[PDB]
Amino acid sequence: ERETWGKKVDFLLSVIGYAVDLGNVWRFPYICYQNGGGAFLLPYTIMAIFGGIPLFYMELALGQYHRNGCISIWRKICPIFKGIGYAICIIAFYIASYYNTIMAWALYYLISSFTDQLPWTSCKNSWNTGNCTNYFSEDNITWTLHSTSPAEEFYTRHVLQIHRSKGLQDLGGISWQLALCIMLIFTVIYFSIWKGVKTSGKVVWVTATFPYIILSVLLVRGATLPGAWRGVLFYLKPNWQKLLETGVWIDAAAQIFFSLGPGFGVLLAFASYNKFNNNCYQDALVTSVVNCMTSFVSGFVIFTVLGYMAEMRNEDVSEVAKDAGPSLLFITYAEAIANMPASTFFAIIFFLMLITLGLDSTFAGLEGVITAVLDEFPHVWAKRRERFVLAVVITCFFGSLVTLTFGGAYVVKLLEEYATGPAVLTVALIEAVAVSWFYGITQFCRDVKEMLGFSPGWFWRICWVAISPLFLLFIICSFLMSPPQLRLFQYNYPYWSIILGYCIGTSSFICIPTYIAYRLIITPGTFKERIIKSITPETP
Ligand SMILES: CC(C)CCC[C@@H](C)[C@H]1CC[C@H]2[C@@H]3CC=C4C[C@@H](OC(=O)CCC(=O)O)CC[C@]4(C)[C@H]3CC[C@]12C
Ligand SMILES: CC(C)CCC[C@@H](C)[C@H]1CC[C@H]2[C@@H]3CC=C4C[C@@H](OC(=O)CCC(=O)O)CC[C@]4(C)[C@H]3CC[C@]12C
Ligand SMILES: CC(C)CCC[C@@H](C)[C@H]1CC[C@H]2[C@@H]3CC=C4C[C@@H](OC(=O)CCC(=O)O)CC[C@]4(C)[C@H]3CC[C@]12C
Ligand SMILES: CCCCCCCCCCCCO[C@@H]1O[C@H](CO)[C@@H](O[C@H]2O[C@H](CO)[C@@H](O)[C@H](O)[C@H]2O)[C@H](O)[C@H]1O
Ligand SMILES: CN[C@]1(c2ccccc2Cl)CCCCC1=O
Ligand SMILES: *[C@@H]1O[C@H](CO)[C@@H](O)[C@H](O)[C@H]1NC(C)=O
Ligand SMILES: CCCCCCCCCCCC
Ligand SMILES: CCCCCCCCCCCC
Ligand SMILES: CCCCCCCCCCCC
Ligand SMILES: CCCCCCCCCCCC
Ligand SMILES: CCCCCCCCCCCC
Ligand SMILES: CCCCCCCCCCCC
Ligand SMILES: CCCCCCCCCC
Ligand SMILES: CCCCCCCCCC
Ligand SMILES: CCCCCCCCC
Ligand SMILES: CCCCCCCCC
Ligand SMILES: CCCCCCCCC
Ligand SMILES: CCCCCCCCC
Numbered sequence: 001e002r003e004t005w006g007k008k009v010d011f012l013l014s015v016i017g018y019a020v021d022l023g024n025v026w027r028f029p030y031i032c033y034q035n036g037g038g039a040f041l042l043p044y045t046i047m048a049i050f051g052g053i054p055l056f057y058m059e060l061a062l063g064q065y066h067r068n069g070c071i072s073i074w075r076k077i078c079p080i081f082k083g084i085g086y087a088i089c090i091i092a093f094y095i096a097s098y099y100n101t102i103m104a105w106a107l108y109y110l111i112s113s114f115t116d117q118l119p120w121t122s123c124k125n126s127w128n129t130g131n132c133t134n135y136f137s138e139d140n141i142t143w144t145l146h147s148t149s150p151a152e153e154f155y156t157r158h159v160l161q162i163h164r165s166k167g168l169q170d171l172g173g174i175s176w177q178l179a180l181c182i183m184l185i186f187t188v189i190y191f192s193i194w195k196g197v198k199t200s201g202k203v204v205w206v207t208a209t210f211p212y213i214i215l216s217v218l219l220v221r222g223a224t225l226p227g228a229w230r231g232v233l234f235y236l237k238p239n240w241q242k243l244l245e246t247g248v249w250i251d252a253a254a255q256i257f258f259s260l261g262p263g264f265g266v267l268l269a270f271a272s273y274n275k276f277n278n279n280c281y282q283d284a285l286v287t288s289v290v291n292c293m294t295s296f297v298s299g300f301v302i303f304t305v306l307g308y309m310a311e312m313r314n315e316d317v318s319e320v321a322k323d324a325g326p327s328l329l330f331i332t333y334a335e336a337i338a339n340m341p342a343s344t345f346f347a348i349i350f351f352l353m354l355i356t357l358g359l360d361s362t363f364a365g366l367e368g369v370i371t372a373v374l375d376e377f378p379h380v381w382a383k384r385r386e387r388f389v390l391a392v393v394i395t396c397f398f399g400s401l402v403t404l405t406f407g408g409a410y411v412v413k414l415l416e417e418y419a420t421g422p423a424v425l426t427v428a429l430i431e432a433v434a435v436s437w438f439y440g441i442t443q444f445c446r447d448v449k450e451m452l453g454f455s456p457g458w459f460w461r462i463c464w465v466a467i468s469p470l471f472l473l474f475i476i477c478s479f480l481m482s483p484p485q486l487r488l489f490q491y492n493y494p495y496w497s498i499i500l501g502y503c504i505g506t507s508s509f510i511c512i513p514t515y516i517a518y519r520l521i522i523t524p525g526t527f528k529e530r531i532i533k534s535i536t537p538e539t540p
């Protein structure tokens with residue numbers, strides 16, 4: 001028999017810690033500022049109500065009924081789409097390649113914070129070149145275009161050492177400091193998810209609830225600051241005319257789908273361990289509302305601190321938050337923390353928040369892949385979950401050996417934009433179409449009624465058959481036609497970077513058509529018999 005969760009709060013906190021991550025602490029406030037303001041919460045809630053939330057509930061109920069991973073459920077839903085599972089696996093190898101190393105940066109920052117004076121306050125250090133001017137109106141104020149804040153120098157010349165990498169063309173060298181700081185992270189991850197869901201479910205009691213104990217302290221500190229009101233009044237001020245631009249809705253859809261994550265193959269893995277009669281409706285509602293409210297509150301703390309630091313300089317906002325990426329956590333917020341009264345305590349606390357914020361998501365992705373593979377091939381890797389988790393962790397670390405180089409930030413951005421792009425959305429769209437159209441939403445509603453005790457309402461069937469595919473289609477058709485012009489640390493990505501990104505995404509996607517061709521060509525029969533007997537779920 002499978003290994004059930006052992007306690008319901010284990011499942012709740014696992015999903016809650018997987019939904020909240022290092023992205024929505026820097027990505028949601030930046031996105032809310034850039035795309036409107038308080039007028040972005042309307043498209044956020046509109047694309048959450050009809051978008052991420054019904055897909056979230058669909059995946060949870062599907063996994064909890066079929067009791068399989070993401071490579072084996074398709075044996076009893078639509079056998080031709082089994083390739084989806086493989087695609088999901090590949091996607092993890094990309095995300096776990098870069099996501100982990102971001103936490104590595106955080107860990108290094110935390111190791112740097114154990115000093116009486118934080119290293120990114122003064123700029124008389126070794127890595128700190130000219131063009132500093134000490135920032136924050138320190139002594140003589142001659143802030144020019146060539147000047148650079150000390151935290152920027154610390155991030156891009158000590159933690160990253162990106163100045164010894166000419167660019168994405170030459171990723172010269174490799175940081176041994178970051179290599180150690182990520183070997184420790186992978187040790188933590190593997191020893192937290194190795195024994196399965198009986199240990200990875202009690203670990204997330206302290207890495208999915210510590211970020212809240214830390215957000216509370218960070219919020220109470222930020223709110224009682226000089227310049228908090230300007231930091232919030234520039235976060236919730238509605239640019240209503242911004243709603244008229246399709247980009248705002250496109251971005252709200254992308255944000256909700258990539259913060260809830262309905263389609264990465266992890267919700268099925270977590271829900272498959274649930275008891276049969278477990279209420280997935282209440283779990284989906286609670287762990288989606290908690291995700292959305294956590295994103296909102298994290299935006300509050302980020303913007304209150306930003307407003308404080310912009311009021312200290314007595315200069316306007318939107319030039320403080322120039323950088324659109326993890327730099328915001330390591331260059332801007334680190335600066336504002338370094339100017340706080342008890343700078344050391346809040347630096348340590350903030351980077352502990354970041355590490356515990358990313359750890360749950362890494363646990364969840366890795367365990368989704370582990371469950372999928374452990375269930376697809378049950379005879380091999382049965383009494384050896386530990387060895388397979390070891391192989392998964394080693395493979396992820398070896399794939400993360402490139403983002404640890406000096407041009408590490410370049411590959412981190414390249415994997416951040418691609419990999420998790422139209423490939424993930426296409427996989428999720430094929431999942432929604434396979435369950436709702438092929439397996440039939442009437443049979444899915446019969447399954448959900450025999451589990452929960454009530455058939456899904458008309459809203460759920462309408463949002464599963466029609467609106468949710470017509471939402472992933474919106475995101476996909478809007479990501480493909482508009483190609484990004486990537487940039488990071490005054491580096492214009494080359495021509496071949498977009499080709500490399502397209503190949504990165506296609507490597508993930510091509511798992512689906514390949515398996516479709518394989519199954520249609522190996523199956524005996526005529527021209528139509530192949531598809532008719534490859535759509536019907538396999539008899540037990
Ligand atoms: C971000 C800051 C400013 C707000 C702090 C929010 C937390 C205090 C909340 C958010 C999510 C909550 C958790 C969400 C899920 C659950 C599962 C719940 O478990 C049950 O299902 C038990 C129900 C019962 O039988 O009474 C126990 C509370 C707990 C851990 C909650 C405890 C309180 C938490 C951490
Ligand atoms: C603006 C201020 C007052 C903050 C208060 C917001 C909450 C009261 C709302 C905002 C979004 C809501 C959620 C958005 C989506 C839904 C789906 C909804 O599903 C349905 O069955 C809806 C049926 C229908 O819409 O006809 C159940 C409630 C829930 C979780 C909502 C619960 C209540 C939430 C958190
Ligand atoms: C010391 C540094 C420089 C190298 C790190 C090596 C790791 C890849 C190894 C070393 C110790 C290993 C663990 C020690 C022993 C085993 C038992 C091994 O056998 C089982 O399947 C145990 C089954 C059971 O628990 O009964 C499974 C892998 C595991 C847990 C290992 C997981 C991988 C670890 C961390
Ligand atoms: C169905 C066949 C497709 C299989 C895979 C084909 C590979 C195609 C890869 C194309 C890569 C585009 O990758 C995608 O580009 C969009 C375009 O805005 C960028 O997306 C970016 O802008 C959007 C707004 O639109 C926001 O959500 C956010 O600021 C960021 O994600 C990212 O870079 C990536 O999400
Ligand atoms: C892309 N980010 C996610 C993720 C999934 C699996 C592994 C790592 C990560 Cl980072 C995708 C699902 C929503 C939030 C989550 O962090
Ligand atoms: C600042 O940087 C520019 C090039 O980015 C360089 O030419 C200039 O000499 C630097 N200033 C100082 C004081 O080092
Ligand atoms: C009528 C329901 C609209 C829901 C809007 C939620 C976010 C609005 C925040 C308050 C406006 C500044
Ligand atoms: C992140 C990669 C997921 C799939 C795991 C590949 C390696 C499995 C073991 C192969 C060597 C024995
Ligand atoms: C119940 C919460 C579990 C938190 C993570 C494991 C803690 C183990 C402590 C004993 C070994 C040092
Ligand atoms: C996100 C906070 C809760 C949203 C609704 C959860 C539904 C639980 C059923 C009982 C509500 C009182
Ligand atoms: C029984 C499984 C057969 C699968 C054949 C092809 C799988 C996808 C290959 C795409 C590149 C990894
Ligand atoms: C694609 C699965 C069935 C393969 C049968 C032969 C198809 C050959 C013509 C299409 C080539 C693109
Ligand atoms: C709570 C799920 C059902 C919501 C109502 C759907 C139909 C609305 C009236 C046409
Ligand atoms: C040599 C075989 C490589 C894998 C073939 C997968 C099916 C091809 C369909 C035309
Ligand atoms: C995660 C399991 C990968 C299996 C891929 C099979 C492809 C055969 C060519
Ligand atoms: C970093 C956590 C590792 C936990 C392993 C426990 C080993 C005890 C002998
Ligand atoms: C049975 C040993 C499990 C050890 C869990 C360690 C968790 C580290 C974060
Ligand atoms: C019943 C679940 C209790 C969770 C408490 C975790 C607190 C960790 C600091």
Ligand SMILES: CCCCCCCCC
Pocket residue numbers: 387390391394395398
């Ligand atoms: C004990 C099993 C370890 C297998 C490591 C595989 C690494 C693949 C790159």
Ligand SMILES: CCCCCCCC
Pocket residue numbers: 174175176179
């Ligand atoms: C310069 C030291 C490199 C450390 C990593 C190489 C072996 C994993």
Ligand SMILES: CCCCCCCC
Pocket residue numbers: 437
């Ligand atoms: C139940 C709807 C399935 C999709 C319809 C496609 C018509 C060509």
Ligand SMILES: CCCCCCCC
Pocket residue numbers: 437438
């Ligand atoms: C889009 C194809 C749907 C087929 C459903 C199964 C046949 C009734």
Ligand SMILES: CCCCCCCC
Pocket residue numbers: 441442461462465466
């Ligand atoms: C097939 C069950 C009801 C579907 C409602 C309409 C979807 C477009």
Ligand SMILES: CCCCCCCC
Pocket residue numbers: 458462
């Ligand atoms: C999307 C709502 C459809 C309602 C039609 C069926 C009412 C019994």
Ligand SMILES: [Cl-]
Pocket residue numbers: 024028255256259291292295296
């Ligand atoms: Cl969010």
Ligand code: NA
Pocket residue numbers: 019020021023024258259260291295
């Ligand atoms: Na999130």
Ligand code: NA
Pocket residue numbers: 016017018020021207208356357358359360361
């Ligand atoms: Na987390």
